[PDB]
């Protein structure tokens, strides 16, 4: 089927024109997208979601060069290469992409997000779903392995139940750093007093 192309962090009017002209469409969300187009690595919801699903994450040259050719080119040579940000976050995009393609990062995870977290619960939720985790929109009331709560200092009134039932309280970085590297380390993101 025709590509459903997502963009993040760029206005790429040239690329948008290429998408419709070549017979693809604009993706309305990471979940419906086949391709993410962008120029750099950024921790946006779309970027993390796209990585989580392990879809192609391509530079602006893919659609540009595709349009010169007259058809959607193969993605392989257009992978986003951002050595500066790969260094900044201490990971390899392509390595992280292979990980996502081999396994779902958050398989077996049930994750609740408190209301003051950034990105907000629904958007944090779409990052969780895209990694094969179960987004918990309702407050969990029992302990289960790999059942975690994402919270923050100002959400202490919301930690009341998790705390009673013995659920781990974790920083957003568990997901924001974890999804980006495609490495899940719940032990390292436990919130201290």
């Amino acid at each position: 089927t025709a590509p459903k192309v997502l963009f993040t962090g760029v206005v790429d009017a040239r690329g948008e024109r290429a998408v419709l002209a070549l017979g693809g469409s604009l993706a309305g969300s990471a979940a419906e997208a086949s391709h993410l187009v962008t120029d750099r690595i950024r921790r946006t919801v779309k970027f993390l979601c796209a990585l989580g699903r392990g879809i192609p994450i391509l530079s602006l040259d893919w659609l540009h060069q595709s349009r010169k050719a007259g058809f959607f080119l193969p993605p392989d040579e257009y992978v986003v290469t951002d050595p500066e940000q790969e260094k900044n976050f201490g990971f390899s995009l392509q390595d992280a992409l292979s990980r996502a393609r081999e396994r779902r990062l958050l398989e077996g995870y049930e994750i609740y997000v408190t209301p003051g977290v950034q990105p907000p619960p629904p958007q944090m939720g779409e990052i969780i779903s895209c990694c094969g985790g179960t987004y918990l929109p309702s407050m969990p009331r029992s302990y289960k392995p790999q059942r975690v709560v994402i919270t923050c200092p100002q959400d202490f009134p919301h930690c009341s139940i998790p705390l009673r039932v013995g659920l781990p309280l974790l920083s957003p970085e568990f997901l924001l750093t974890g999804v980006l590297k495609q490495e899940a380390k719940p032990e390292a993101f436990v919130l201290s007093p």
């Binding site: 946006t44 779309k46 990105p119």
Partner: peptide, 5 residues
């Protein structure tokens, strides 16, 4: 622009 985190 889209929020970065």
């Amino acid at each position: 622009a889209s929020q970065e985190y």
